[PDB]
Amino acid sequence: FVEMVDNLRGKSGQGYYVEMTVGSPPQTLNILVDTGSSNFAVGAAPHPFLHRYYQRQLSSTYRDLRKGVYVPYTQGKWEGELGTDLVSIPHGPNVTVRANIAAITESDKFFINGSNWEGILGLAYAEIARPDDSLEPFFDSLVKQTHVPNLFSLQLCGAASVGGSMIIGGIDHSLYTGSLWYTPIRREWYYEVIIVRVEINGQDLKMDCKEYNYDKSIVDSGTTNLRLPKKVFEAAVKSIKAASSTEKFPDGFWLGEQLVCWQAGTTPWNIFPVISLYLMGEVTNQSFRITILPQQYLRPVEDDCYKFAISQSSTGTVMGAVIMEGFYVVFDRARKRIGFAVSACHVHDEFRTAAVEGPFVTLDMEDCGYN
């Protein structure tokens, strides 16, 4: 899969995108890779933020579905017109498929001023596609129409420009060290998983594990932060505050309301704790744990300054880029599981590294899921 390595680009905080083509002749667009949604939707009008946009009038293979779609989401919205066309991924498998495409014709707070992408590729399942689950997602079409295996993997490398790899239809073993460890996909909608335990510097938060997954926990390339349910965020910040109490910081820093700075090259990584999430394993009463460093959860904002990139949530746990940049993540749709391995590109120091370890004995893991 050498050709797919390094096929993702981005800017810090603006997501990861992959190059795609749509239509005949092919129109090249950069498309945000989002495992937290399920629509393929592209700019189709000259919004001033856009470098380029889909011009359906130039495509001989465009077909109008004569149906609108309206997509508000928590931080923005887009609306558009549904159709189909031929779609390929230049630095992906050597195939062309006919996919659903929403031509975006109105939006608010969707496109980012200064970003280099023009659309979104929702890689999650049909259950959360708009307008409904009859609108086949891209990846479903790709697998249905070709011999591409039903999985993809993401190595998000971070930095400012960011880079990474989306391996479509397989796994590139050069992108990780150690073994992959798999957690089940609980339900095929979001990439929903179950967190069974949480430790800060090896110290158990000791919460009822249902709280960790209230009302769900997902793996989401389209979210920057690690987001935690309110009650869990409360407890985690308390523990992270206690662990790092060598230095003191304003209450606003922990709420993401202000930054913290140090003299360039002297950031005291050592005073900040590691964070471990234990995930439901593949076997009864078996779990494994993934562990990230402050290098993952303290995000640079360009003295070296940083934002606290763990935040509270009313929509459950979201394992965003803060988690994913530690790991090579395998979305093994064929076996309804997600694999984690230590990423060969993750940022660490001479003392600590991100880790994926197991097996551990964990009882009552089925009670951790919210119903």
Ligand SMILES: NC1=N[C@@]2(CO1)c1cc(-c3cccnc3F)ccc1Oc1c2cc(C2=CCCOC2)nc1F
């Ligand atoms: N996972 C996730 N994707 C976002 C929000 O959270 C989304 C994120 C971004 C974004 C912004 C900054 C950095 N990274 C990003 F992915 C941009 C557009 C966008 O646009 C959409 C998103 C989510 C959705 C959803 C639609 C219906 C199903 O649930 C989500 N729709 C969007 F249009």
